[PDB]
Amino acid sequence: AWKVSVDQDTCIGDAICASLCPDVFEMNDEGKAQPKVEVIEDEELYNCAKEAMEACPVSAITIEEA
Amino acid sequence: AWKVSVDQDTCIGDAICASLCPDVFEMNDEGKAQPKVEVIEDEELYNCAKEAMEACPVSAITIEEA
Numbered sequence: 688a689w690k691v692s693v694d695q696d697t698c699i700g701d702a703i704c705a706s707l708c709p710d711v712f713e714m715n716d717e718g719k720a721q722p723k724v725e726v727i728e729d730e731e732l733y734n735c736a737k738e739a740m741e742a743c744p745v746s747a748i749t750i751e752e753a
Numbered sequence: 754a755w756k757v758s759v760d761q762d763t764c765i766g767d768a769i770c771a772s773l774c775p776d777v778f779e780m781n782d783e784g785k786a787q788p789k790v791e792v793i794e795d796e797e798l799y800n801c802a803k804e805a806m807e808a809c810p811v812s813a814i815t816i817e818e819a
């Protein structure tokens with residue numbers, strides 16, 4: 688499966704990630720992105736998550752595969 | 754780009770990873786696997802690293818992308 692993470696230091700609350708993939712990303716109290724789930728198994732959620740990772744203007748998103 | 758890592762605690766020195774992807778994995782002095790590279794850009798190397806990750810008997814290998 689997959690695992691998504693957002694570097695809370697890099698993120699600038701652009702929110703383009705939560706826009707493209709609202710099922711995977713959400714805004715926290717610090718006004719930064721944050722993974723919605725701790726695991727992605729569905730191939731479509733993986734597709735928009737990777738779509739978000741590609742869109743983040745500060746490259747705060749990474750995706751791990753196990 | 755991709756980044757490979759081996760959990761030093763999980764690894765049991767099966768070495769099937771270095772067998773399949775000898776350009777990515779090597780054995781360290783502690784008898785455990787260790788990525789000999791810090792970044793994979795090439796897709797050929799990416800494939801055998803994903804080949805090894807699925808072959809490792811204790812799931813000590815993970816691949817992250819950015």
Ligand code: F3S
Nearest residue numbers: 698699702704720743
């Ligand atoms: S800046 Fe933060 S809010 Fe989303 S688009 Fe990049 S991870």
Ligand code: F3S
Nearest residue numbers: 764765768770786809
């Ligand atoms: S046990 Fe260690 S040596 Fe390779 S096959 Fe798994 S990472």
Ligand SMILES: [Co+3]
Nearest residue numbers: 713714715716
């Ligand atoms: Co909220």
Ligand SMILES: [Co+3]
Nearest residue numbers: 741743744746
């Ligand atoms: Co970019």
Ligand SMILES: [Co+3]
Nearest residue numbers: 779780781782
């Ligand atoms: Co040596």
Ligand SMILES: [Co+3]
Nearest residue numbers: 807809810812
């Ligand atoms: Co397995």
